[PDB]
Design a protein around this ligand. Structure first.
Ligand SMILES: O=c1[nH]c(-c2ccccc2)nc2ccccc12
Ligand SMILES: [Zn+2]
Length: 208
């Protein structure tokens, strides 16, 4: 029951999503090994992901979390990069899309930095890169990210360089503690706490 609606580049909604995508690129400590070498993207398409059942699944859980957290869902828009992007948009997030070996345990991981999520597009550590060229830094092949609505609720703060949420919390926040340019990363332990709202198709761009 998923349909994808293309946004026009003229639509303010397209523009605000592209701006989040572009302005949250950073340099990574792997020098580009996993995600490639780039300072910006070429955005090819932004589509709105519409699925009534998945949406109501999200909002049902959002209200539960909200009622357990003084009427505060603590909702963010965050990036998600995954080899499973096609299954996520049709079926929603579940345990099969968790990063089992993640530093905050087996959950589903999201990033404020688009360039962080870009590192998982072709798998953990960038896998073997793009299917066609086996190039983790491919400038030709089309990549896809999700920009997602994520319910954090009471988030456990972890200072740092499917399982369950820590008791009394609805999520974990990875607060970066040495790379002063890194933004936060987040983990949820229930698929129903994220809705894959925008599908963004793009290429990374070779720097000049
Ligand atoms: O966007 C992120 N995706 C993933 C990921 C890991 C395994 C399978 C599928 C997706 N992990 C992340 C870890 C930190 C920040 C963002 C992401
Ligand atoms: Zn390629």
């Amino acid at each position: 029951g998923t349909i994808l609606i293309d946004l026009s580049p003229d639509d303010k909604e397209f523009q605000s999503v592209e701006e989040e995508m572009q302005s949250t690129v950073r340099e990574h400590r792997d020098g580009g090994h996993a995600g490639g070498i780039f300072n910006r993207y070429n955005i090819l398409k932004i589509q709105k992901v519409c699925n009534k059942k998945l949406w109501e699944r999200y909002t049902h859980r959002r209200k539960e979390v909200s009622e357990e957290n003084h009427n505060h869902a603590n909702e963010r828009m965050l990036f998600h990069g995954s080899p499973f992007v096609n299954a996520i948009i049709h079926k929603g997030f579940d345990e099969r899309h968790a990063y089992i070996g993640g530093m905050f345990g087996a959950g589903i991981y999201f990033a404020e930095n688009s360039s962080k999520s870009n590192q998982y597009v072709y798998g953990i550590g960038g896998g073997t890169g793009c299917p066609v060229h086996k190039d983790r830094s491919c400038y030709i092949c089309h990549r896809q990210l999700l920009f997602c609505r994520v319910t954090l609720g009471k988030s456990f703060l972890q200072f740092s360089a499917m399982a369950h949420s820590p008791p009394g919390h609805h999520s974990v926040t990875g607060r970066p503690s040495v790379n002063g340019l890194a933004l936060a990363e987040y983990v949820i332990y229930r698929g129903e706490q994220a809705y894959p709202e925008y599908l963004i198709t793009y290429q990374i761009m070779r720097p000049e």
